[PDB]
Amino acid sequence: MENVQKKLRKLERDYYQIREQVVSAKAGWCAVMRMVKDNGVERRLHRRELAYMEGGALRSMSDKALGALRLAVADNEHLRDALRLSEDPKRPERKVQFFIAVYQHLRERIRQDIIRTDDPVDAIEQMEIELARLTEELTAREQKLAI
């Protein structure tokens, strides 16, 4: 029975390790949850469809998205730097910051003179309107130049 007591002690130390894991995880979650509440988590990040997918596939999906972002963000330099920093696995919050750093940047370059939608996802429609208008202007300009 003393061996069973020692086994219980082993179980208790394993429990101690698991509890430390969980409490540290929540301590980390605190700030990321506080910052993501700027509409980030409402529907964008929390793709609840993925709640039933093993981390093995999620890692590959994030890796593929990172590969695409490398090419996409080549022109920008501050966004490139933020993406570079966001690869550390011991500073999770940085990833969310990058998302914010995108939207904020995507909000600065809106050229709000003729656009209003703060959310860039809805700025695509106004951009398409702008391209149509500019194509008509291009036709008019070409005719004037010819004459």
């Binding site: 529907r43 793709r47 469809e49 709640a51 429609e125 309107i129 208008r133 202007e137 008019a140 005719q143």
Partner: protein, 147 residues
């Protein structure tokens, strides 16, 4: 729960696009009959807009030729026609884009659209696992003591 869990991811993704698609429109989709009704509203809007788009295009071409032969009043009208033509041009594009999403939405997700949330059942059934566990303990206790 093993069956329901396998059902959660497909259902969950299907409704998430619906809500995103719902946000793209001014109405709420909660039935197959409603979807067809809104789709026809979408299609009829499409036919009307192209008729008006063609109408304004006829007006623009006539005014463009009038200016070509030659004035400011003609330029002012042409600019107004370009503004109206652009405004109606995007309307046809958006309505066509909205229909395409609806067609794809019904092509793929119509099998599980507007269905019961399997997460709720999984939550309830899993809650029965624990409440069943009490029956395990309170019948294990009886056999431990009475013996």
């Amino acid at each position: 729960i093993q069956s329901l869990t396998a059902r959660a991811p497909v259902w969950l993704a299907a409704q998430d696009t619906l809500n995103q698609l719902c946000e793209q429109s001014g109405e709420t989709l909660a039935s197959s009959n409603d979807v067809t009704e809104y789709m026809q509203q979408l299609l009829e809007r499409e036919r009307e807009a192209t008729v008006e788009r063609d109408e304004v295009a006829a007006q623009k071409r006539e005014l463009e030729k009038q200016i070509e032969r030659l004035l400011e009043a003609l330029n002012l009208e042409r600019d107004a026609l370009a503004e109206r033509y652009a405004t109606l041009s995007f309307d046809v594009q958006k309505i066509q884009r909205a229909h395409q999403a609806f067609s794809q939405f019904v092509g793929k997700h119509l099998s599980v659209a507007f269905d019961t949330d399997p997460e709720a059942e999984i939550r309830e059934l899993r809650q029965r696992h624990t409440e069943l566990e009490r029956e395990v303990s309170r019948f294990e206790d009886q056999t431990q003591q009475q013996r």
